[PDB]
Amino acid sequence: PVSVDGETLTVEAVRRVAEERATVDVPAESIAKAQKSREIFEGIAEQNIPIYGVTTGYGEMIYMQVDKSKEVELQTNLVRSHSAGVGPLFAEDEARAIVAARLNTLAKGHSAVRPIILERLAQYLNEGITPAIPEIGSLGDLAPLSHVASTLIGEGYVLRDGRPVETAQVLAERGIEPLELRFKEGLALINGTSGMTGLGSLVVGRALEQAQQAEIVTALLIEAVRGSTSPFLAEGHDIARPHEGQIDTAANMRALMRGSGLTVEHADLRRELQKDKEAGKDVQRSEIYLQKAYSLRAIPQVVGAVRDTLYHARHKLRIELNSANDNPLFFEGKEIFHGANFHGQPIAFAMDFVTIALTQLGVLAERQINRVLNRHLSYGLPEFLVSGDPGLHSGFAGAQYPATALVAENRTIGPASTQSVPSNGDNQDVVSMGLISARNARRVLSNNNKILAVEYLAAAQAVDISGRFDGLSPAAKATYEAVRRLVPTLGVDRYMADDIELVADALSRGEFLRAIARETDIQLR
Amino acid sequence: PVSVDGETLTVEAVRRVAEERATVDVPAESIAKAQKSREIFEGIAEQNIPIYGVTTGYGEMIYMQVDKSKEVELQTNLVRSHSAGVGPLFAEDEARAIVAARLNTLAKGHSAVRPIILERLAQYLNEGITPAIPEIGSLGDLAPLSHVASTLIGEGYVLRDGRPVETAQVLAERGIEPLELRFKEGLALINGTSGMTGLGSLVVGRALEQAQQAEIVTALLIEAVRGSTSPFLAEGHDIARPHEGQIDTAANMRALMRGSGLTVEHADLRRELQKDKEAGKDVQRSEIYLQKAYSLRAIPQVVGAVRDTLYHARHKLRIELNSANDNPLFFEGKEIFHGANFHGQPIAFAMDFVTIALTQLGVLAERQINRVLNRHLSYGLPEFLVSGDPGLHSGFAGAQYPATALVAENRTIGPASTQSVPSNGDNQDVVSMGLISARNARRVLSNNNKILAVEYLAAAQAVDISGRFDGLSPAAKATYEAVRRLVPTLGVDRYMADDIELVADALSRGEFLRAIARETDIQLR
Amino acid sequence: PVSVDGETLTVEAVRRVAEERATVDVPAESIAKAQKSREIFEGIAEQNIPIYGVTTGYGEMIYMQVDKSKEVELQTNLVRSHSAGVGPLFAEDEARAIVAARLNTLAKGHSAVRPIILERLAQYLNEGITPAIPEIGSLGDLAPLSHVASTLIGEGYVLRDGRPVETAQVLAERGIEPLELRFKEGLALINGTSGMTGLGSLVVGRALEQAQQAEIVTALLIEAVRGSTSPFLAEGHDIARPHEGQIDTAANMRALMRGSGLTVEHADLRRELQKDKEAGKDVQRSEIYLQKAYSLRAIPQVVGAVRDTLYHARHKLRIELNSANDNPLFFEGKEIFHGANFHGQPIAFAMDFVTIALTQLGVLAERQINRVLNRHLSYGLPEFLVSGDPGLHSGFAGAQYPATALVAENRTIGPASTQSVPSNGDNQDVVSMGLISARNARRVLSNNNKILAVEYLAAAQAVDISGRFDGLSPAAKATYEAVRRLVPTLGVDRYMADDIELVADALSRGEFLRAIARETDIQLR
């Protein structure tokens, strides 16, 4: 079970609830802290004193004072008038992550909402009731969260087999009686960063697994091309350049290639090269390369930088997940806090940074593909990995194009966290556009799986063409088998699309990270 | 019927074939010119002389000389090895536009393909056989066109109710015997810009209708707010600043508001303002604005600039549609032309420019929405168009957000025509990424319909709140009725998403352009 | 004196050396380490053992084996052939930061450089010999570092009065004998990230001061328009949403407005509303805003997010400064390390994020300017801060434009860390472009000072027009006076460009941060 206590929720926890339908539980302590903050708050709203969104209009219309006698209407009109989302609907897991983020937020106890709201949200998650949430509308997350809030009151739509269905129907067929929003409840359900933070959580968690799966195929490729292990030696990172991510990537690369009979040690390389040099020449040519190209050597530095960005994003997301990103807020013994914790700037930036970092991860993976397919660049491998008569067959020549194209495409994706546009009578004069940033990172993550899919297939192909299977390390063999289990060796030319999408789906499921765990002792950071 | 003669095909013609399933016909003359270019070419290939893609390997593997005895295999291996597309599938109309563009290209007669290829392509279009074409893979359009070529040989997949189905099955169930590719036919079917040019055609055609529909709601809005007609007077454009698009937009605005009883003439404005000024004051305040804000005045200049960009794009597309964008090429009495007419740079640029122009069209539409919803900015209209008790009801306050958000999103879309990345052993060292550019423009076009949807609804709402219906011009009344036919006046607050998507779908169908044509004499440029 | 030991250098220290010309000293322990490593390495090189860039060609030409008899020539040809920088030259302070970063890198003792090289770079810094370094060339920093390396051997140019002067002459004048590059010294000098790390250090250090100065004006503005203090209450951050930067910004704002007679507490706002309301009916309008717009309420969340980004960048830069970003590397008792520690991905990413963060800092400042100039949003202040008769005078109307334009300009600056382009026979197939990333950030930083300059002038003007000087807090009176000491109150309209440039310059040297330190007891985070 996952404890949604507004204090200890983690990015991985969110993914379990969202992706693996893990049961959720709001601890008694959170319910208690919620019921008590609600109790006090109600006594305040009963005196009809000015409170944003409770006894006043919303946004710019805050100058409008509303009498407590309207309590339920004010909250309902809000949820309805703001359910203005457009575009595609979020997938089931994305919608669950968002709902989980809003629940954790309210579970912190400063939102002044009745316990049944938390209970009803936890119920929807546990009973598989997923709101239909359109992706566009959030300025950074009113619209998206309004569609969620709608379902709690028997309105809006819920997801069922990919399509939206009236909430009223699904609820009636559940024996669940919709709720009636009271003081501040409508506002609290929609005034937060749960959309960008929920989706961001999924993206960053998966981004880290992608970094791992990139290291996994990179290792296999390095073995298949008989690269040097020098670039990954601990001294060059742990000692000479202590960036956390760099140290982690190098450690993972050393572990992945451990036991390989194909990789080369620097000592052997220079000795081999030394034997190759004559004594009378001041300058002489050699076919031996003491060092390989950047794409097969600067891995610790590049993927490591990506990891650093991802670590920073996860840290921000963890703080956010367990924060009262709502307004106004309640603190026992104090005036009602009127601030802007609903402003997603910290997540907007974090996700924009993830978009950039993942784009470079893809750039690296595509150049490695180029490396293995180019005869002048690959170590003893036929052009474009053609196993038969080249020219007559193109081998992987056509498969490189989608990878190359996705790099160009990811590069057309610009930062959204800096594109605020003033709205609502200039009341919202500076916003974060955070959910766009999150959707941007998701897109790159998705495109990267396709790029990586081509690389995984190319690597497995490089293995059988060279006849180097037996030399592969235990991990490389596991990776190879995982690919071959999905797609066979490329003999004559054939329709490629199905094979690529098959491997890319596997990557999106973390299937290669699983193969390593299930087939080796290796523990990847 | 649409004549696909490789000489006179127009962007509108492509849309008819693609969107309205208009019958296609390859004229006897084109078939003749095709059979004759094929005849001669065959005599050339029979001498086993070096010809790219016919008797040699493809791309970098052109150094590989292939014997004519392989004819069919070479062409088939090519189509299969290059069907490496990934991502979503193009919709039925998009796939039809692409196929139509490839047919027109071959119909020009310099591709040296057998007539049955043209006949079979025309057959697929006329019989409703739509290839399943994944959107990603083209470097600017091998992969996408390879998926098309696959279906001609009974391979790959075809679209059926949104899903891909094996071509072999569908063909067998059609009594159609797949084709067998011969000398150069596989290469000719995939070596062109038909993907970006086919999709570009649809986008630009629809872009022009969007410009018209933006002018339509802008006119209604100007009437509803009682704006001045001064900005649209012919002298200010036809004489003072002769940009084609500017002249066209102003002419359309004058025609649309013709007969309005709400608009104001400059003469009346200054007279009204003159009566309002005292004689003893050197400087005095007034609530009268002789001029309105840019969003309700710089329409000719802004939408006109958009039109200019769109006119330029359509011109490029028309030239491209009727060009031999293929390689190598055949010209009677000459050596086989080995060039690069498959390079989509002219379309890549054109579509990137359309992406930019349409983004600004959206920027303008969103500020007009802001204009009508802001009490301090709208002419005698309640805040956020709330017809009842503001504050208690938010009216259109929540509806502005998706429009504002889409502007920010369109701004994160960067040019693709400059992002070439070298591939295929540096053989393709400079590409255009044109299909990405085309998909970029499509996205903005799609987002703009949502922005416009909010504006159309806001305008109709501004009409009933002000009680100005009776004053609307014949065209404004037609536009108003068209909206009300889909969505009712906004009384109390209510779920907005459905209403917005309903109007946006209508816009994507050109429903408002239709209302004007069907309800008025007005002829819009 | 700043200790350059390759272990403890800080960004702050880098600035002292670069901006304040603090003296540099390589500690004896570092000299001893470098000496020992040099002697051991020399013994290895003397045996003609294959070592990258010592006994082999460079980059792709690593396959060329060069005899040790060409020691000096090899290192020298490298520096010359790579001194291909173009574009403007870095300023004195920027060039010193680059030299400083390189010196610290070599001082770590893993570069196998003779101690004299450390001594000479130190001497250039301590004696004011500044390399003329072209800003463009680095793929991320060979070209720019090669121009620096050139000056050590008496070649290239030295900067003087913004003009380049042949090094040989300068050294001849100062009485210094150029050095002769020995094994690996040419490569060690140019094979690192000192260009982006040096420049990045200055930028990040100043960016933090810019965040402080943004908080300083914002505090003054808030007092000038009597905004609420509820948004900065500790429990809303320290407790509710503990993002480090957010907590710091709130804490700073709290300290800045302490002792103000103009700011209002939420308790007051609600009491004023409670009284303004006369419970006769349910819904009523009020002129009182219980909460202010985002630009005056979301300060901790937005500037806090910027701080978070800057803290991460500073942390990455601190690690990088004290790293052996060079290749190959010497580790006693171990094989020579052949990796890629010269790859700037970690800093390239870091600076791209700083570019993004600062852009948003400017977006916020520009909207705050819009706030006080717009009569509908200023809260009683005259339109455009005109003190005389509006219309006849425009006041600050024209001054807003450069600020607005700069926001647009900063948004046209895209990430560079993702724009790698393969070069050098594909040996450098994945680079970082980090120096471009650092210059992008410097540009936004510079542009922001202009935006803030207009805001500082507008704030002070608002103080004057409202006659609220006496009600200002101590910090606010100090900020106000600092401005007034440079620019007079705006009476009649007048040329504004000199006034803005004067305050923009004051901001670039941190004069406002200094006024606070000198006039108050406030210590800002």
Ligand SMILES: *N[C@H](c1ccc(O)cc1)C(F)(F)C(=O)O
């Ligand atoms: N997030 C609130 C809000 C603003 C505007 C509309 O239409 C709905 C909700 C808020 F106002 F911004 C706030 O909580 O301060």
Ligand SMILES: *N[C@H](c1ccc(O)cc1)C(F)(F)C(=O)O
């Ligand atoms: N468009 C051709 C091509 C190149 C590469 C691959 O793999 C398939 C097809 C061409 F080579 F570029 C050409 O026609 O010149």
Ligand SMILES: *N[C@H](c1ccc(O)cc1)C(F)(F)C(=O)O
């Ligand atoms: N930075 C080195 C380099 C590369 C290319 C050229 O032309 C000069 C120097 C290196 F190669 F990258 C290296 O491995 O250090």
